[PDB]
Structures are given as structure tokens and as C-alpha cells.
Write an enzyme that holds these catalytic residues in place. Structure first.
Site, PDB file in Angstrom:
ATOM      1  N   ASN A   2      48.387  50.674  40.208  1.00 34.76           N
ATOM      2  CA  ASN A   2      47.482  50.219  40.191  1.00 34.76           C
ATOM      3  C   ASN A   2      47.359  50.878  38.188  1.00 34.76           C
ATOM      4  OD1 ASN A   2      45.796  48.716  41.259  1.00 34.76           O
ATOM      5  ND2 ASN A   2      44.776  50.741  42.696  1.00 34.76           N
TER       6      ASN A   2
ATOM      7  N   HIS B  22      42.721  42.765  40.676  1.00 35.38           N
ATOM      8  CA  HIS B  22      42.361  43.494  42.012  1.00 35.38           C
ATOM      9  C   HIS B  22      41.863  44.625  40.911  1.00 35.38           C
ATOM     10  CE1 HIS B  22      43.060  45.724  45.099  1.00 35.38           C
ATOM     11  NE2 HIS B  22      43.371  47.297  44.813  1.00 35.38           N
TER      12      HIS B  22
END
Ligand SMILES: NC(=O)c1ccc[n+]([C@@H]2O[C@H](COP(=O)([O-])OP(=O)(O)OC[C@H]3O[C@@H](n4cnc5c(N)ncnc54)[C@H](O)[C@@H]3O)[C@@H](O)[C@H]2O)c1
Ligand SMILES: NC(=O)c1ccc[n+]([C@@H]2O[C@H](COP(=O)([O-])OP(=O)(O)OC[C@H]3O[C@@H](n4cnc5c(N)ncnc54)[C@H](O)[C@@H]3O)[C@@H](O)[C@H]2O)c1
Ligand SMILES: NC(=O)c1ccc[n+]([C@@H]2O[C@H](COP(=O)([O-])OP(=O)(O)OC[C@H]3O[C@@H](n4cnc5c(N)ncnc54)[C@H](O)[C@@H]3O)[C@@H](O)[C@H]2O)c1
Ligand SMILES: NC(=O)c1ccc[n+]([C@@H]2O[C@H](COP(=O)([O-])OP(=O)(O)OC[C@H]3O[C@@H](n4cnc5c(N)ncnc54)[C@H](O)[C@@H]3O)[C@@H](O)[C@H]2O)c1
Ligand SMILES: O=C([O-])C(=O)[O-]
Ligand SMILES: O=C([O-])C(=O)[O-]
Ligand SMILES: O=C([O-])C(=O)[O-]
Ligand SMILES: O=C([O-])C(=O)[O-]
EC number: 1.1.1.27
Lengths: 322, 323, 323, 322
Positions: free
Chosen positions: D128, D183
Site C-alpha cells: 500500500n 483501493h
């Protein structure tokens, strides 16, 4: 396409061939080419098998073919092309060596197609008489000795193991029972080497979990298993266990698993044998037949094994005498 | 003293489909298997072959053969394939499932009597053709609960529809949702409007040029003719690989209470306005047997097609009655 | 009205091993899962993560968390990992399973009370260290039948022994049968004489030069030190991947009545001359729980090694008594 | 060795990395290299995972490494290298975009190792903030646009599907629910495209099997799922579903399955987007990202999607501003 699926060519799309294609669909093991001289039927099985991928939720291509150019690029070739019995003979007289004159011709034809279109394939012969046919295919195709073998002993061993497993009330996964030698009446179920997770069966017998008589009975049943199924089916011979045996060998090669799967392999001194194929313990991996296991057989076992070797030698004689 | 017993499936009929379903049970270690048949000899041959396969699969299930109904006692699931596949005398081109009616009804009624007596608590999946007619026949002759009896057919028809579409879009059939409903015969209804690629309407792919409307129509027709094509090409009997996996997939959804959407022939009690009959509809199979029957909002056009399927079933059920 | 229900496994302890076993159940669709723990928050996090994995695995099992014993009611199998892995204050080099005794006995007795009350018909697999001592503790505190309680350990020790040998022979560990018996600690007994390659004695391979006697001895030692090595390398907690699969493999052998030979800590009633205690021995696990305990003909030398393992267990059981 | 096993390099041997190695062992999918800058811990997981092969009865090699030369020959590289949270921040304030400054550095380092040692690999980024990191890796490594993607939407969709599956009492295998976009909080759960085996969810709602309110609730829960797990675990973030999502993507490539697995892909006009990666429906096969599915989004959906696109664009700005 950077990553291509493995490809397996089933030379012979009969009972065993079609079932192996089915196993490929279920496991998503490889694209399948169902090859045969028969037109129509192979396409029907291809349609049936390819439709099964939907329910299996897998994706492999299953097609049929009757032209060898179609097996080009095959990683593995599994050969079942041949007759399962002599036309007209009663099941009572079913005999694997009797198929020699009918199948040698077929195997030679297949050998030419493989030599020409996919000479880099790992080849697993299933066609009976097994040991003789593997040698016939090897001689005609010119493939490397470590890339040609015959499926038989994994099936013979599967029977030996199942019978023992039923008696001991233990899963066959945990029974190591091995048959070596020729795939026929003189096959050799190695009773002394039977273990329950490595523990000698002898210890179980002494504890009364199996009697010496039951063991002898199981050894005999293992030898006659193929014929019993031929007698009972009344049409053809075994195919579910044979198909899975061959596919297990193919997978061990494709995924370089290095599994101990007894099969008919080329001999150059092992067990004192030369220029011939016979069932022996072997390890199959990405290098094909990677190891041929040489067991310290007893005099009694050697006697039995020499009888198995003689059957192969004489069959190989008859093959040549053609 | 076995506290945890294996599930048990009785294959009533040990021919091509029955033997193959036994094989699937061995490979997945799904349950113990009883290969039942009126024929003696052959089923024991298959039980030997299938049981020997457990060694290579490294699984442990019991596969035995039987010709006495007492042997299916305690079966959790019964899958019935007992019956003829083709009518003696008919050419392959003349092959029609409806013609099997007179031969198979007799067989199915005999099986119903056996299940009713020995394993009335089983979930029953009928496979024998003509499917929708045979499922109804089994249900009334056996007296089993409506939610515990169904017919395998639309999962197979749908598998065909899905595979053909998957091939054209170059996408795994896992991600193609295509469904056939109605009777398992020429008037089956492949629902073109409900075909999706992971829930995305196929029409969007057609508009993008991924495949054409004409190819979809060709596939719809190919789906209806698929069984007859395999009969023609095989030259002997009919399809068994996909049919076996379709039925075992339904059996497993019941055994493991998976709650899978598996279109099959189910007892109608109002859906699509039908009563006292079985016909292929989308349904959810779980530990409660047929847990849900999905009633789609069909267009008038689709209703007209569905009505023909219904008329075909009504007609066979009348023929069944006339016996 | 669910006639066919899914199997249910309660993971008592939802730490590294418990969460991983829940994951295995999801991947194999083996059973519904209850992640039990005294800790709240964390187990629900894992149940969320594990349940979400069913979508990707395309399986359907229920994974929930719990901190109340009433929630494990109806469990077919209970796998206990509740306990400490290391003693606060000890260096990793000083790591010894025996030191966990005072911390974990308390925990295991609490779990026994919960199982006795809510799911006394369950097959119980203890994992918590010191293993052999904790299994005995659970058994007497819970009162469950001797054939329904065992300890996972030797399947893991054997997995290590097998992997090391497999690497040297260039053969899949599927075909290496190597077994460790005795207590799960420094005096465990890797049975060098019983190592086989598909039933063929390892000694024949050594004589053929495939590997040496010296390498076998190195492997025997490596097998004993394996757990401590992972503790040292991980720096935190201990092994969980192989331990989780070992226990789930035992659970599955029970659930599906597979009758697998899986060495584990079992109740002794005469074997190898032992009474009132649990220790690792080769055993067959099936639907009847521990169905067979294999008594090998050990040599005097092997007996001497085994006796040390026994003395270690006797000693911990005495320490357990002194509480 | 004629047939070699596939090879997958896990760049990052933490929770997700180790679990993916475990999945490889269970499925015998490929040899595994557990790579990390940390020494010790990766070798411990390698020992644990390799020992699991014995019980799984599979044979793949699992080793650890801290030198990139070790990932040479990798068919697939899955990248989890990075932080799961900002050091010191409360779980309440966990935010994926906050990891940018800490992980961009790491991804650039990994990109150099992959470019140098296994430039022919199919790359799946997990680290991430996902969409930004995939673009960061792609820019730095120079790999082909169809060979780099980010795992996110398969996980987001897995949640969306599980929640719907629980409400309808149907297996998630039969729920097609898809999340596209970035996301993060602005991910887009496509409610209009949710189907039960291709049958629109709307038909189920009208039949009273689910209410419009429950659906809205599920869409919100899908967005917050990652944060809920972070809150509940109290240490790190999700890894079981993330690992399986990434491995499912890797398998689709390795076995050329052609699965529809929404993931962060390179845009060149699709949805009117250019020079950037964002989650979209895509087909993964042996040619990597073989198809990027362009849905006919409604005005309302486009609005929502543009918000998702803006988050990626601004994050990509901040990335550049370094
Ligand atoms: N080694 C073993 O353990 C073992 C076990 C069982 C059967 N077998 C043998 O395997 C073989 C196949 O058995 P099956 O049950 O599948 O038989 P089958 O009769 O079902 O099929 C054999 C197939 O080969 C085809 N064929 C014949 N000549 C061919 C040619 N020149 N080229 C391509 N295909 C050709 C036939 O048309 C037929 O489709 C037999 O020889 C049988 O005895 C070996
Ligand atoms: N619904 C579907 O989608 C579908 C698909 C394919 C085939 N089928 C049908 O399934 C059936 C089975 O096909 P198959 O390929 O297995 O056929 P098959 O000919 O191979 O076997 C049918 C078996 O049933 C046995 N049988 C006959 N009467 C019996 C009785 N009274 N009790 C027990 N067994 C009896 C036969 O002896 C034979 O072994 C056929 O009716 C076929 O048309 C249905
Ligand atoms: N037998 C073997 O082969 C083997 C192998 C590895 C580890 N182990 C042992 O297994 C155990 C678990 O290891 P792990 O890695 O999962 O540890 P872990 O620290 O990750 O988890 C242990 C869990 O049990 C919980 N717990 C503590 N007291 C509890 C109670 N009263 N009730 C319910 N839960 C409670 C903890 O909160 C924690 O979640 C340890 O004792 C370890 O030494 C055994
Ligand atoms: N996209 C998604 O759906 C999704 C889902 C969950 C987690 N994630 C992310 O995945 C990543 C990993 O999560 P995790 O739970 O496995 O984390 P983790 O903390 O367990 O492991 C990350 C690992 O990477 C290592 N690392 C750090 N710098 C490195 C470098 N330069 N080279 C190699 N390794 C290095 C660390 O040492 C550690 O072992 C995080 O960024 C997390 O936020 C993404
Ligand atoms: O060769 C055969 O036919 C057999 O053994 O089954
Ligand atoms: O019913 C049939 O025979 C078919 O569809 O395969
Ligand atoms: O008991 C242990 O921790 C081990 O062996 O891994
Ligand atoms: O990215 C995450 O951590 C998640 O969604 O689980």
C-alpha cells in the site's frame, strides 16, 4: 503468451485415453489432445471432457485429432493405442502377451509420429504387453532412454496396497507395497518390502493383524487382478486406476515432483539387466526417469525376478522375429 | 465404535455415468460408494477398478458393488442413472430423449420402491432420461419429500452454454455465468439475456465487438443440440464425463451444505405459475436439499420459449400417466 | 431444516496456529470454524479475514470468533493451542518447552472444563506445550474417553525428519516414511532404523552411496533441534505453518474416517510397557478416534533412548501433580 | 531437468509473504523464495513452510534470501515489502495513503532488483498505497505494461461477495460482486453489477431476499473492511484473504487460466484514463493482463469513479513531488 499451459497428448482415445483427459480437466493439469485413428468418437469425448471444465471451474483446452502434426509441442505423450484383447478370444483366456502381434505394429506407427512431431516429449506407454511395447517404442522412436517408460507397476502396486489396506484397516496412503518385474503373471509383489509408514508388515503379522496365509493370498490376488476385472467387465479391461496411474506419472514429470513410481524403465546393468525395459522402482521428476532403484534382493526374490525377466526376454525375441 | 462416519452415496445404475461418479468420489474422497445395478459382474469390475484407484489418489473410501437394494441402506445421497440411453432400432440422427419414456419409467418405478424401503431419508438426484418426466415419476412412486428429490440436467446444459461462450471470449468458464432452464430436450431455454462475465452482461462485450450476436445465436443452438451431437460422434451410448461431474457437484452441494446455485429439475409449487410437475429451474442446493427455487422475471418472448418447454413436460407426464 | 450439516471445528486459542488452522478449513472447505480466545478483538479480526478468504477459494464454510464456551457447543473436533509459546525473561537460546508448564497447565484445565460442559463428544487434539504433559492434563480434567483425546507433535517432528531426508535423496517427502516417537522435546526419538523410501530401508540407499550415515546422524539431530531453531530465527513466537497443517491433517483423518497412520501423543495402556500417561507413538486415526496404537519392536538401544523420553514425561507429570 | 517447476519470488516475507509461500506449498504451485531485508525471520518461515510440504505430501522448494540475485528466473514476483502503518499512529487513524513516503522508497528499491535479476517476471504489487505503488514500480522497473499489476480489487470484491453471500444464504462462488477503482475509501462496489449466477441482485431485492438498505450497508462495510480488521487485530493488517487473492492472480498467470480478477492495471484510454494504474475488471492469463474490461458506467457511477481516480491522481502527484 509468456506462460503457456503444459500439453499432454493422449495417443489412443479409448477408455484409458478419455479418462486421462478427464483427469487433466479435473486437476487443470494440462491442455489435452485426444488422438486416435478413429474419427468421430474422439471428438465426442473431447466435447464431453471440455464441457466438464465448466463444472470443474477449470480452464484447459481439450481437442481431438487424427493427424500427428496435432501433437506437436506435447510435453508428455501417453500411449494407450492398441487392442485390449485378441479378437474373438474368451475372457477366460485373456493373456497380455497374446496382444504382441496386434500392438507392436501400432506402437511402431506411434513411435514414428512422436519422433517426427514431438521428440522432446516424456513418453509413458500403457499399451500391452507393456514391457515389450515400451522397448518397441523406444527402439523405433530414438528417444532418450530416460524419457521413455511404461506404466504398469504403479497399477500393480495400487492393487497390492489396496488389498493390504483393507486387511489392516489403514488408508492405502500409508501402505507402501511394491510390485516390480514384468506386467504379467510373473510380476513380483515384494512382500518383504511391504511397510505401514515404513514399519515392516512382518511386525503386524506377528501381532496378529494379518496372517502369513492372508499375505500369500494378497500376493496372488495382486497378480490376477487385471484378469479378474477383464472377467467381470465382459468388455475391455481396467481404465480408472490405469488412467490415474499414468497421469500420476505424467504429473510427477510435469511438476518435477520426484515421486517413487515403479515403472518399466531402460536397464543398463541394474539388476544385471541390459538393453531392455522392465518394471523397477524409479523416481520420476523433471528429468524424466531420474533414478532407478536397485534393491538388495534375496536369493529367493532373485529367482522370482529372473522368471519375470525371462518372460520379457522371450517376448522381446518374438517381437524381433517380425 | 465409529463416531464420525463417511458420507455414503449409492449409484443406482453402474454404467458409464455411474462408474464415473464413483471415480469422482474416489478422487475427491467424497464418500463411500455402492455401485448398484441389475447386471452382475460388470459393477464388481468397476468397484474393483475404482477401489484400486484410491491407492493412487492416496484417498480412503469404500467402493463396493450390489444388485440387492438392502445394500443401499443408510445412503446419504442416491444418484439414479438406471435406464436405457438409446432406443434399439432408432438411427443416431433419430435419437430423441422422449422415446426412452416407455423403457425407463418401468426402471425408475422399481428404483423408487427400493429407495422408499431402504433409504427414504436420502437426497435423490435423478439422471435417467427423459429427465423431467423421470424425476416426477420417481418422486410420486417413492413418496420422498419434495425438497429431497431433483433431476440433474440444467447444470450440464449450462456447462455447455458456458464452455462455448468461454471459448469465444477467451475467459475461463469459471467466470462465465450462462444458464439453461426448462426441460432437458430440444425446447430447453438457454437464457441469452442472463449470460454474464463475472456479473457483467454479455451484451456489453458484444457491443465492444468481443463476439457477435450471430455467434451467440449459434451457441444458443449448439447448446440445445449438444447431447445429440455427442451421441452422434460417440456412436455408442451418450455423454458421461460432464454428466457425472454435474451430478456429483449437486451431491456435494447437499453433503457439505454449500448452498450452490445449480439449475436442476425441481418440484413446482407456483413458480413461473406451474404446479404438480418437475422442470429445470435455477435453484440453491444445500444441506436442506433444494433450499431455494429462483423465479426469474422472464420477458414475454422468453416466457413463450419456456411455455414450449413446459408443454413438452406436460405431454410426457401425460404419456407416463397412460401406463 | 438442514439434514446434512457441515462438520464443526472449534479452535481453542486463536493465535498463530489457531488462525492458520481456520485458514486451512476455509481452503479445503473442511468444516465450519469457531475461533475461540480469551482475547477479544483479535479473533474477530481473523474470523473476518478467514471468512473473506472463502470468496476467493470459492468455498463456503462459516468462520466466527468467540470468547464464551457456549459457542463451541456441537463441535465435532476441538483443537487446543491456548497457551504461551515462550517464557517472559528467557533468552531464545534458553527456550525450553518444559518451562511453559506452570503457565499452560492452568490454561488447559480451564479449556477442559469448557469442553467437558459444552462438547464432550468431540475428538480433541491438543497442541499446547509441553505437549505430552498438557494432553494428559486435558484428559483427566475433562474426563473424555481415552480414544478421543490426543496430542499433535510427532506428525510435525516426523515432517521435519522426512523433509530433511527428502532433500538429500532428491525424492518427494510423500515417498519418505520417517517417524519420530516419544516426547515432543529434546529426547524425542527419530527412528533412524525405520526410515524408508516407499518402504525400501534407507540403509540400502546409504550403502549405494545416495547419502551417508554421517548425514543421517546430522538429520536426526537437526530434527530434535528444529523447533528451537525456528524460535531462534523467527525471533517472535514459534512455528505455526507446519504445526497447523499437522493438526488439521489429524482432524481430517477423524472427520472423514481416513484411518491414517499419524504418530501422536496417545493414552498408554500397556504399550511399550507404559500406563497412565500420554506419549508420542505411531497411531491410526479414524472415525473411531485413536483406532490403533502401533507397538514397534524397538532394539535395546532404541529402548534406552525411548526410556529417556518416558522419564522426561513422568517428570513433567509429577511437576504437574505438584500444583 | 527438462520440465522445471514454476518459481515465485515473495519480495517481503512478512505476514502476507509467508502465507503466500504456504499457499504454494499446499497447492504445489511453485518453488518459493522468501525474500526480505530482514535476516533470520525469513529463514524461519522458509523452514516452517518447507516442513509443511511433508504433511501436504507435495514437493516444492522453499528457501529464504536477502540478495536479489536469488530471485533470478522467477516467473512471478509478488511484492508485499513495505509498512502496514505509519509508526506510532493509532489504529483509529490508520490510512493507506499515509504510507506513501515510507513505501515508495522500498518499491523503488525492489523495482531495481527485479529490473536487474528477473525482468521477464509477471509482477503483482500488494504494498500500500496500492494504485500509487504499482505505478511507482512500473515506472522504476521499466517492465511491460501488461506484466505489472496490483492486487486489491480481488480482495475488495471478496469482501463484497462474502457479505452478500451471507445475506442471501448462497455460496460466495455464486455471487459475482465487483469493486473497481482505487483501493481506499473511494473504492467503488458496483451494486448494479451484482449478480447471483448472472441473475441481477435487483430481482432478489424485489423478491424480498435483501433490502435496499441492507445493500447500502454492505457497500459501506466493503469500503471499511480493511480498517475494521486493522482495528480488531491490533497488530498489522489482513493477510489470509490478501495472500489468497494475490496467489489466485499468480496462478491465473502461471497456468494461463484467463480469469476475471479485478486488479490495478495500466490505463491508455480505458475509462478515459491515461498514464496511470487503477483497479479495473481485467482478465489474467499467460500473457499477463490480457484484457481490461470497459464497463458502460452510468452517470452516477462515473461520478463515483472520477472521485476514485482523483485520489490516485493526487497520490501520484505527491509521489512525484519527491
Ligand atoms: N500397462 C497397464 O497397466 C495397462 C492396464 C490396462 C490396459 N492396458 C492396455 O492399454 C491399452 C488401451 O486400453 P483401453 O481400455 O484404453 O482400450 P480401448 O480399446 O478403449 O482403446 C484403445 C484405443 O486405441 C485406438 N487405436 C488403435 N490403433 C491405433 C493407432 N494406430 N493409432 C492411434 N490410436 C489407435 C483405438 O481406436 C481405441 O480408441 C490396451 O493395450 C490395454 O491392454 C495396460
Ligand atoms: N439428464 C442428463 O443430463 C443426462 C445426460 C446424459 C445421459 N443421461 C441419461 O442417463 C442414463 C444413464 O446413462 P449411461 O451413459 O450411464 O448409460 P449406461 O447404458 O452406460 O448405463 C445405464 C445402466 O443402468 C442399468 N440398469 C438398467 N435397468 C436397471 C435397473 N432396473 N436397476 C438398476 N440398474 C439398471 C444398466 O444395466 C446399465 O448399467 C440414460 O437414461 C441417459 O439417457 C441423462
Ligand atoms: N505440539 C507441537 O508440535 C507444537 C508446535 C508449535 C507450537 N506449539 C505450542 O502451541 C501453542 C500455540 O502456539 P501459537 O503460535 O498459536 O501461539 P500464540 O501466542 O500465537 O497463540 C496462543 C493463543 O492462545 C490464547 N490463550 C491464552 N490463554 C487462553 C485461554 N485461557 N483460553 C483461550 N485462549 C487462550 C492467547 O491469547 C493466544 O491468542 C504454544 O503453547 C506453543 O508452544 C506446539
Ligand atoms: N493491496 C491490498 O489489498 C493489501 C491488503 C493488505 C495489506 N497490504 C499491504 O501489504 C504490505 C505488506 O503487509 P504485511 O501484513 O505482509 O506486512 P508485514 O509487516 O508483515 O511485512 C512487510 C515485510 O516487508 C519487509 N520489508 C521492508 N522493507 C523491505 C525492503 N526494502 N525489501 C524487502 N522487504 C522489505 C519487512 O521487513 C517485512 O518483513 C503493506 O504495505 C500492507 O499495507 C495490501
Ligand atoms: O493390464 C491390464 O489390463 C491390467 O492389469 O489391468
Ligand atoms: O441427455 C443427454 O444424453 C445429454 O444431454 O448429454
Ligand atoms: O513445539 C514447537 O514449538 C515446535 O516443535 O515447533
Ligand atoms: O489494504 C488493506 O490493508 C486491506 O484492505 O485489508
Amino acid at each position: 503468451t509468456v506462460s503457456r499451459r503444459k500439453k499432454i497428448a493422449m495417443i489412443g482415445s479409448g477408455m484409458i485415453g478419455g479418462t486421462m483427459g478427464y483427469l487433466c480437466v479435473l486437476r487443470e493439469l494440462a491442455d489435452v489432445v485426444l488422438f486416435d485413428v478413429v474419427t468421430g468418437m474422439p471428438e465426442g469425448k473431447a466435447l464431453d471432457d471440455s464441457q466438464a471444465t465448466s463444472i470443474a471451474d477449470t480452464n484447459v483446452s481439450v481437442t481431438s485429432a487424427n493427424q500427428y502434426e496435432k501433437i506437436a509441442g506435447s510435453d508428455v505423450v501417453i500411449i494407450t493405442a492398441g487392442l485390449t484383447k485378441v479378437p474373438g478370444k474368451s475372457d477366460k483366456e485373456w493373456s497380455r502377451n497374446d496382444l504382441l502381434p496386434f500392438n507392436a505394429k501400432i506402437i511402431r506407427e506411434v513411435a514414428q509420429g512422436v519422433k517426427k512431431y514431438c521428440p522432446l516429449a516424456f513418453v509413458i506407454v500403457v499399451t500391452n504387453p507393456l514391457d515389450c511395447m515400451v522397448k518397441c517404442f523406444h527402439e523405433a522412436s530414438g528417444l532418450p532412454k530416460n524419457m521413455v517408460c511404461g506404466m504398469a507397476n504403479v497399477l500393480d502396486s495400487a492393487r497390492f496396497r489396496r488389498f493390504i489396506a483393507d486387511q489392516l484397516e489403514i488408508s492405502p496412503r500409508d501402505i507402501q507395497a511394491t510390485v516390480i518385474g514384468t506386467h504379467g503373471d510373473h510380476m513380483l509383489p515384494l512382500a518383504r518390502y511391504v511397510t505401514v509408514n515404513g514399519f515392516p508388515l512382518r511386525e503386524f503379522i506377528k501381532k496378529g493383524k494379518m496372517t502369513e496365509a492372508k499375505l500369500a493370498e494378497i500376493v496372488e490376488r495382486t497378480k490376477k487382478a487385471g484378469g479378474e476385472i477383464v472377467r467381470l467387465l465382459g468388455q475391455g479391461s481396467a481404465y480408472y486406476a490405469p488412467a490415474l496411474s499414468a497421469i500420476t506419472m505424467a504429473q510427477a514429470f510435469l511438476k518435477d515432483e520426484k515421486r517413487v513410481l515403479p515403472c518399466s524403465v531402460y536397464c543398463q546393468g541394474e539388476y544385471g539387466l541390459h538393453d531392455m525395459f522392465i518394471g523397477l522402482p524409479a523416481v520420476i521428476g523433471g528429468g524424466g526417469i531420474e533414478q532407478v532403484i536397485e534393491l538388495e534382493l534375496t536369493h529367493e526374490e532373485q529367482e522370482c525376478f529372473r522368471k519375470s525377466v525371462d518372460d520379457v526376454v522371450e517376448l522381446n525375441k518374438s517381437l524381433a522375429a517380425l
